[PDB]
Design a protein around this ligand. Structure first.
Ligand SMILES: *[C@@H]1O[C@H](CO)[C@@H](O)[C@H](O)[C@H]1NC(C)=O
Ligand SMILES: *[C@@H]1O[C@H](CO)[C@@H](O)[C@H](O)[C@H]1NC(C)=O
Ligand SMILES: *[C@@H]1O[C@H](CO)[C@@H](O)[C@H](O)[C@H]1NC(C)=O
Ligand SMILES: *[C@@H]1O[C@H](CO)[C@@H](O)[C@H](O)[C@H]1NC(C)=O
Ligand SMILES: *[C@@H]1O[C@H](CO)[C@@H](O)[C@H](O)[C@H]1NC(C)=O
Ligand SMILES: *[C@@H]1O[C@H](CO)[C@@H](O)[C@H](O)[C@H]1NC(C)=O
Lengths: 120, 106, 123, 120, 120, 123, 106, 123, 106
């Protein structure tokens, strides 16, 4: 489908077209300012992914466990009976905590790898 | 494991060497061959670290060397209080971290 | 001034479990990697397990890879080892030692620098 | 050699200096607009590489087979008897197809890796 | 700690907060020009890391040996008895050499990997 | 209502090949991973091969890693297995089963949920 | 493979347990121990999945548990129509996916 | 016109070492991978080691992984092999050969294209 | 290693085939099965590369084929100067690069 065609699709189906939305983020002083701001926001999202250990990835698995209090729904209800727009609302109050946990777990992983490589 | 003589001895005032042998993938690859002195009934203490380096506080009579796949601990100026079970150990890579030999009774 | 004090168990039968613990003093606990070395009553020394200074990287000798868990608490200055199954061949003195690893920014170790006196574990 | 010094070199020799050209892509409203556009195009190329699974790479191998109809030349003629300027012309009519195939194969690889990691 | 809180910390302690400084790099024609220049410099640093084989990493180990003449201090003096501000001064005359060596070693690594993958 | 129907072969000699196929009905074929389980005439059950729901990830028991190919067609609702060499020790009933894997966004399985009746392959 | 008794039996109206044993790396590591009931001449059917969970449609007389490296299927209220070859199976990691035991004739 | 000339050693005893060297002519040395093939006096041929055209990737037969080092100098057109330990079972003629690998942008080889005459190494 | 006959012969003017056998993981997986001709006292020379391709300069009397796990070198038009020890070899993946068979005396 096309840009945002999956907006009404379930999460487990909508994830099939992540590339379609990813490619549409980069594609008269006010307009130049808007373009510079769009570039800065793109780079902020790429930096945020980079500091989590997710570089050239659209789907990236991490080692942060789900704490249940964020959302205690069954896995099949989240992926088969929900859209991404609804999910973005259910956990809108927990994204800062998750982001902090991801940053800390990446710092621990990078330090452990640096030490592991030293074993001659 | 490394192969060591089962017993090395001499009279006080003399000197001995205690050998330690292994293979080319461990003792002959990594220059980390340490020696321990275990008095009967006591825990071992470190005598030599690295290959030829001695910890601070340990008498200058204990020294050593390595060539090929053979390491040697030299004990000069033998005293009556040096009777102990001596052990060699070495680093053997990321899979097998440390390999110890058998004890050598002085 | 460096001291490691074992506070282990006694006799268990095969299929059980036993937890060993060591207390450290005289040095900064979090600055050194620590390990366990086993000595059967009539045998020489062998390495059993190694834990790094942060308690995030653990290594085991093949014979215990599926049986022993090594952990540390840097606020308590406590090292502990949880041993399962404990077969007849595992009777030995278990010594805590400081050394055996260095976390990349420290000089090389690859040796056991300090030793405790050892807990006696029997089966 | 220097910037574009390899332009007349063969492909198998010209590939030795990819870094030299890569480093020269980033190195008065009209000038500011030109700079913003250059940044956007750089990011579009980096995003395009990222969605193919080629992140921090100048040479990146993929799992898309060559279909021969794109070019049926012997491998040694392409790498030893051609320049990159000529090659860019021989297959100028097929780059969109190749890019689409690369994007699809990366989507399949990422989904397969996500499922493979789930085997406890 | 906060932004640059580790500036007076030792190198082996200051490295614990690299993320804190990394996140503060992206966070009226003169102001727009300053923003565009800041974006270009960020991208130049990311490209420089990318050509060394260090993409989504804050701590990255390489295969370039230390030549001692750059600095012959003991490892424990550098990491426990120095700050990053002092270190940046001790080796300020050698960074171009190190960067060139890193670029060359990455070119060799990428070519060797490309050839290694060809062994059917 | 779930049914798996085997349409296999018969007797082959060592060094030959035989292709097995299963048709599925009563469920969405593309929603489940499927596998083959072998039972020799006088023995118990053993797992032979596993294919995921998309037909992109395949796993085999060590004894057949170089001999069997597993594939599926989600438009035909057809699972098939291409077996080479077929030695005397491979005489068995080959059952298709649904289950054994789940594609990360589904709940855990790690069991065989539905079974067919089995094709008899002899050597 | 897992070890099971070769035969477990009892009179109708009673109850039995069928054990299944393995090692600490498979049955004692992954909590995925399933049971199958194979009537002679028929394909096996699933009786227990997970460790203690029963599929819908299967009688409440079939239950089970796991402790250590030992799993057990408990069959209460024995009926004459329950005569079957019972099998246990378990997940054993990413290298060896499933390991089955031998059959137990009721 | 292609020629490989061995300039090897003679008799050594176990525990020693011997270095072999080959000079190349008639072709561009840096354009081909090269390898060593061993033939015991009474046996057939076996592969021992392979080095790529740039001297950056080396491969060895398992029996010599911890004993032999293969290197080349593309400015001298010289291939050399440093052999350690040299046990009685290593007595053989050691041949240099051109082929056995191709650096991704070249057509496939997987064969030995040119051969030298061989150095005789005894123990 | 590959299995070859220890000896294959015939009269001048006739033809022979020299077989080479292996397993499904090497000779039957990678289509890189080469043949060498080693005259006594001399180094081997390449006769066949790939599976059925001949190097330039080698007589058209030498040909070959492969089916399953069996490769064959066919020598037609036998001459008295073709007496040599013939060898087969094949690629066997990234771990074991080349595997050779035993020699076949013509
Ligand atoms: C919308 O709802 C219909 C009916 O439930 C469903 O089939 C479809 O997949 C949903 N999503 C889209 C994008 O149409
Ligand atoms: C889950 O979140 C609550 C606060 O919302 C916290 O108290 C609890 O410790 C968290 N659980 C884990 C395992 O971190
Ligand atoms: C140009 O042509 C000459 C002559 O064929 C050749 O040697 C050279 O490599 C080519 N390329 C360049 C960059 O000079
Ligand atoms: C090659 O391209 C043609 C169209 O140009 C297409 O019909 C054919 O299927 C392609 N081959 C493969 C293997 O995809
Ligand atoms: C500053 O100096 C003090 C005293 O030596 C030391 O404890 C502290 O770690 C140093 N660094 C900072 C950031 O305070
Ligand atoms: C170290 O640097 C000096 C020049 O400062 C150079 O001559 C020397 O070769 C270098 N050492 C190595 C090993 O590259």
């Amino acid at each position: 489908d096309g840009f945002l065609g999956a907006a009404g699709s379930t999460m487990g189906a909508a994830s099939m077209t992540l590339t379609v939305q990813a490619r549409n983020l980069l594609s008269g002083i006010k307009q130049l300012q808007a373009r510079v701001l769009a570039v800065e926001h793109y780079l902020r999202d790429q930096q945020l992914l980079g500091i989590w250990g997710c570089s050239g990835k659209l789907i990236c698995c991490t080692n942060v466990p789900w704490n249940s209090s964020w959302s205690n729904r069954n896995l099949s209800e989240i992926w088969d009976n929900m859209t991404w727009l609804q999910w973005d609302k259910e956990i809108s109050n927990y994204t800062q905590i998750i982001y902090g946990l991801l940053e800390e777990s990446q710092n621990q992983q990078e330090k452990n790898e640096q030490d592991l490589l030293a074993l001659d | 494991a490394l192969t060591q003589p089962p017993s090395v001895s001499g009279s006080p005032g003399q000197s001995v060497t205690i050998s330690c042998t292994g293979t080319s993938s461990d003792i002959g690859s990594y220059n980390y061959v340490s020696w321990y002195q275990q008095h009967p009934g006591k825990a071992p203490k470190l005598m030599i670290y690295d290959v030829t380096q001695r910890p601070s506080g340990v008498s200058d009579r204990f020294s050593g060397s390595k060539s090929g796949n053979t390491a040697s601990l030299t004990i000069s100026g033998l005293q009556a209080d040096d009777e102990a079970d001596y052990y060699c150990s070495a680093y053997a890579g990321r899979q097998t971290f440390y390999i110890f030999g058998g004890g050598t009774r002085l | 001034e460096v001291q490691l004090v074992e506070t282990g168990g006694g006799l268990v039968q095969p299929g059980g479990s036993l937890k060993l613990s060591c207390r450290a003093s005289g040095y900064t606990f979090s600055s050194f990697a620590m390990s366990w070395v086993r000595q059967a009553p009539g045998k020489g020394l062998e390495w059993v397990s190694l834990i790094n200074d942060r308690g995030g990287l653990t290594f085991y000798v093949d014979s215990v890879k599926g049986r022993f868990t090594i952990s540390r608490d840097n606020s308590k200055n406590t090292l502990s080892l949880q041993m399962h199954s404990l077969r007849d061949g595992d009777t030995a003195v278990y010594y805590c030692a400081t050394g055996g690893m260095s976390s990349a920014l420290q000089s090389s170790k690859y040796y056991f620098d300090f030793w405790g006196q050892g807990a006696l574990v029997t089966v």
